[model samples]
Target chain A: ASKTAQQLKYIKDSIKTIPDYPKAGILFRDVTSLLENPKAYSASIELLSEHYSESGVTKVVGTEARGFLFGAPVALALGVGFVPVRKPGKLPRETISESYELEYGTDTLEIHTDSIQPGDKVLVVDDLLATGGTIEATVKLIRRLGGEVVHAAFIINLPELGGEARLTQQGIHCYSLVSFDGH
Target chain B: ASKTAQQLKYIKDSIKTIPDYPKAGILFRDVTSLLENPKAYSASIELLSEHYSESGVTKVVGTEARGFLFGAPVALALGVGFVPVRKPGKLPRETISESYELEYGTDTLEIHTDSIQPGDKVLVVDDLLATGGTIEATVKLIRRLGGEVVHAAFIINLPELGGEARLTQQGIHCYSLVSFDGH
Candidate 1:
C-alpha cells in the first residue's frame, strides 16, 4: 500500500466542503484547499500516479480548467506527456471537438489532431466527477485519435451523481481519491 | 546550468508555430505539441523548477487553463502549493477579482481569498507572454491577497508584443525558455 488509511484521511481533511456552491443543495467539495496544502496535494497526486503507474499509460489527458490541475502533475509523475481537452477556441490548431450535456446546459471540448496518436495509451483526469458528461466527451475524443484509454481518474467523486456508473456503461473504468455522497 | 543550450533547442523544436491564429498577422506559438512530447514537456517543467527552485517561492499561481498546465507541474516539482487565477464564475468561494484588457477585448480573473497569504511568495506561470495583461491582473490578485510575486515564467516570448516591458513596469521580473521575434 503506497498510502495508509490515515494518509487518505489527511487528504480528505485537506478538502473543504462548501455549501450551496453554484447551486442550492450542492455540497461543493473544493480542492482549492487541498491544492493549497503542499503535503496533501502531493499525496493526492502520488496516489493517482501510484494507481496507474504500471498500467502502460502513454499520455494523461486533463479536462478543461480543473482537470489540468490534477492531470498535469500525474503526467509528470508518471513520466508521460500531458494533453489538454480544452473548451472551444482554446486549442490553437486543427482539432476534433465534442459536445456533451451538462446539468445546466451543454459545453464543448477539443483536442489537437496531433496530440494523441494511434497506439497511445490514455488516462483521463479531472478534479471531480459529477454526471459523467465531461469524461464521456473526453473519451470520445481520445478514441477518435486511435488511442486506448487505460482509466479515468479524479480527486473527488459524488457517486450519487452517477458519473462512475455512466463511465462504466461507456466501457471506461474510473478512479477517485475521495468521495462525498450527499449534501 | 540545469539545461544546456542544446537541451533548450530540443524543447524549442518540439513546439509548432501556427500563422494567423485567432487574429491576422500574428503567429501563435502552440505548446500543445510541446506538451505532447514527453521529453520536451518534462524538460520544460524541469527548467522552470530549476530556475526558481531556490527562489523561496511558497506558492505557484497559474492563470486559467494554459497556465495551469505549466504551473501545476512546477509546483509539484518545487514541493509547494499551487493557486489558480480563474475566469469569472469559476471560483466558488469568497474572491477578489480584477479585470484587464486583452488583445481583443477585456476579461476578468478571480482568485480565492485564502489561496495566498500575506507572507507567501508567489511564482506566476503561463504558456506564453504576449501583452502581459493576463499576468498583470494575476500579479494584482496575488498582491491584493498580500502575497509577493518572485517571478513569472513562460515557455515562449514575443519580444515585439511588449509583455516583458509591460511586466517590468509593473515591478515584476520574468523568464522564458525560448523566443521568436518578427514572425
Candidate 2:
C-alpha cells in the first residue's frame, strides 16, 4: 500500500461502528475511539496538515462541535487562524446564516460576519460527511463572506449517502481519509 | 518586563470585552480575537502545554464547545487523549452527568462513561475562567469517573469571580495566562 493508504488503514482500524445510534438502522462510525488512541488521532491531524501545507490556506474554517476537534489542531499545525462556523445563538457578533435541510427539518448554520475577509483562502473542516448538507451550507457561508473555499476535509465519509457526489457536483473539492459503504 | 509578562500583555491586548453579553452586568472576555492572531494564539497553547508537559497528565478534559477549541490542541501537544465534557444529549454514548448552577438556573454537563480511566491524571481546560461553575462541575465529573483532575487551565481568568479561589479550595491547582479585574 501507499503511504496514505497505510495511514488510512491504521485510522480505519481504530474507529468504532455503533449500530442504531440516535435512530433505528443508523450505524454511527464513531471517531471518538480513534481520538482515544494517540497514534490514530495525531496521524489524522498530521495528514491534514500535510495535505494543506502547500494549499495556501490562510484560515481554517471548521463546523461547530466535532469539526473543532481536528480543525483547531490543523490550524495550529499550519500556523493559521481557526474560524468557527457555529449554530445560531452561539456567536456573539453579527453573523451570516445558511439554512440546510436536515433528515427531519431545515437547520441553519451561522458564521460570524468578520471571520473571513475577501480573497482569503479557507479550508473547511468537519468530522463526518453524511448527507453533505452541512458542508454545502458551510461552503455557501464561506463564499458569502467573500472568502474562497479552497477545500473541504473530513475524517469519515459515508459513500452511500452520496455526500461526496453532491460536493463534487457542486464543484467543491472534498477529501476524506476513510469511507464506509452505507450511511 | 519578563518574557511571560510580555506574552500575557500581548494576549490581554488582543482579547476584546463585550459588555452585558448574554445578560446585564456581565463583561464577557471574548478570546476569538486572541485565537485570530497566530502569535498570541500559539503562545497561549504553548504556555499551557509547557506548564503541564511535566505534570504527568494523561488526559485533557474540556468543557463543551468553546473548551474543545483549546483543549483538543493542548491534548495534541501533550500527546494525550482529548475527552469532551458536553451539554446533555450531546454525547452519543452512555454518560455520567453533573448539574451545575448557571446565573439563571441550572445546566448539566455530561461525559462519556469511559472517556477517562481510573487513576488517570487529567487536566481540565477551558477558554475562560469566569465563575468556575463549569470547571467545577467538570472536575466533579472527572472525579466521579475515578480520574484525578491534577490541574485546571484556562486562557483568561476573571479574578473578581474568585474562580481560582474556588478551585484552590477544592485542592485542584488552577492556572490562567491573563486575568481581568471584574466580570
Candidate 3:
C-alpha cells in the first residue's frame, strides 16, 4: 500500500522461482531475472540505498562473487569503499580467513588484511540469505579487524531455514527486500 | 587538461600497481584499490556511462565475478538491463556456451538464453583486458544470440598485450578508463 511496499513487491514479483534446481524439491528465487530487468534492478538498488543512507557506513563488504554484484553499487551510492571477501588464493595480498562448515566439507572465506579498520563501519550485502553459515564467517572476519557490523542486507531471505535466527543469536540482524517461505 | 582527461588521470592514479603479482615479470594494475575508494569508483562508472550515453545500448553484458562489479553499475546508469556471462553450470537455465583456449586446456563461458534478444544493442564491461580470448568468446556468445555488441569497456587495458588489436580485428572497439604499459 506504501511506496516501499510497492517497490518490494515489484522486486519480489520480478524474481523467477524455479522448482527443483541443483536438487529436488528446492525453490530458487532467482535475482538473475530481476537483474535483466532495468526498472526492477534499479528499484532494488534504490530501496537498499535508502535503507543504509544514514547508517554512517564507511565500507561495504560483500562475499565472493554474487555479493560483489549488489555490494559494489550500494557502496558507490553510499559514498564508501567496497571490500570483497573472496575464496582462498583469490586475493593476492596479506589476508585473514574464517572457515565454516558446509554440508559436505568446510569452506573458507578470505579478506584482504587492510580491508577493514578499527573504527570502520561496514555493511554486508548479498543476493540471498538461506543458511547463516557464510554470513556468520563474514561477520567474524569483519569483527576480527575491529570493524563494526551494521547489518547484513539481502534481496531474498529464506527465513524458514532459520538463517535469521542463527544471525540474531550472534547479534547480527538480517534485512531483506523480500521473504519467501521454505528453504 | 580537459575534464575527461582529468577524470581518467584520477582513475589511473587511484589504481594500485603491484609488481610481479600472481607471477614474475608481471605488472598487475589492480582495480581493487580503486574499488576501495568511493570517489574513484563513482568516477569510473560515470566516465563509462558518459562514453556510451548515446550508443542506444539495450543491455550490458559482463563477465563473471569482476565484470559483474562494473557492468551492473553501468547498466543501472544507462537505465538498461544487465546480463552476466559466467562459467559453465553457473546459470541454472537454458544457456548457450562458447569455448576459448587458455594457456592450459580450455575455459568456457555461458549466457542465459533469454538474457539478450534479437535487435538488442549490448555493451560488455569488465575490469581489465589482457588477451582478447575471453572477450572474443563473450562477443561470440552475444553474436550467436543475435545481439549487437556495441563495444567492450574495461577499467584498465594492457595495450602491450594486444587485446585491443585482436578485438579490433573482429570489428569490436575496446575502451578503457586507464591503460598501462605491460601485462
Query: Which is the leading candidate under TM-score?
Result: 3
Indicate the residue-level lDDT of B76 in model 3: 95
**Poorly placed runs, candidate 3 (over 4 Å):** none
Please give, for residues A16-110, the per-residue lDDT of candidate 2 as tens digits: 88899978988888888887778789999989999888999999988889999988889888999988888898888779999999878998999
Q: Positional deviation of A36 in candidate 2, in angstroms?
A: 1.7
TM-score of 1: 0.95
How much lDDT does candidate 3 score?
Answer: 0.90
Q: What does candidate 2's lDDT look like per residue over B34-122, in tens digits? A: 87777888889988999898999999989879899999889888999888898898778889999989878999999988888798999
Model 3 chain A scores worst on lDDT over the 10 consecutive residues at A86-95
Residue pairs in steric clash, candidate 2?
none
Per-candidate RMSD, Å = 1.7, 1.7, 1.2
Candidate 2 lDDT at A27 equals 84
Q: Is the docking of candidate 1 incorrect, acceptable, medium or high quality?
A: medium
Give the runs in model 2 whose Cα sits over 4 Å from its true position. A1-3, B1-3, B23-25
Question: What lDDT, from 0 to 1, does candidate 2 have?
Answer: 0.88
Write the residue-wise lDDT of candidate 3 on A1-183 in tens digits.
Answer: 888988888999999988899789988788899999888899988989899999888899999777888999999889999999988987877799999999999999999888899999999999999888999999999999999995999999999988889998888878899999867
The residue pairs that clash in candidate 3, if any, are none
Q: State which docking tier applies to candidate 3.
A: high
The numbered model that scores best in lDDT is: 3
TM-score of chain A of each: 0.95, 0.94, 0.97
Model 1 Cα lDDT, one tens digit per residue, B1-183: 435576699998998889888689877788888887888988998889998978999999998888888998899889998888999988878999999986678889999998888999999999998888899999999999899995999999888989999999988999999999854
- Name the lDDT value of residue B150 in candidate 1: 56
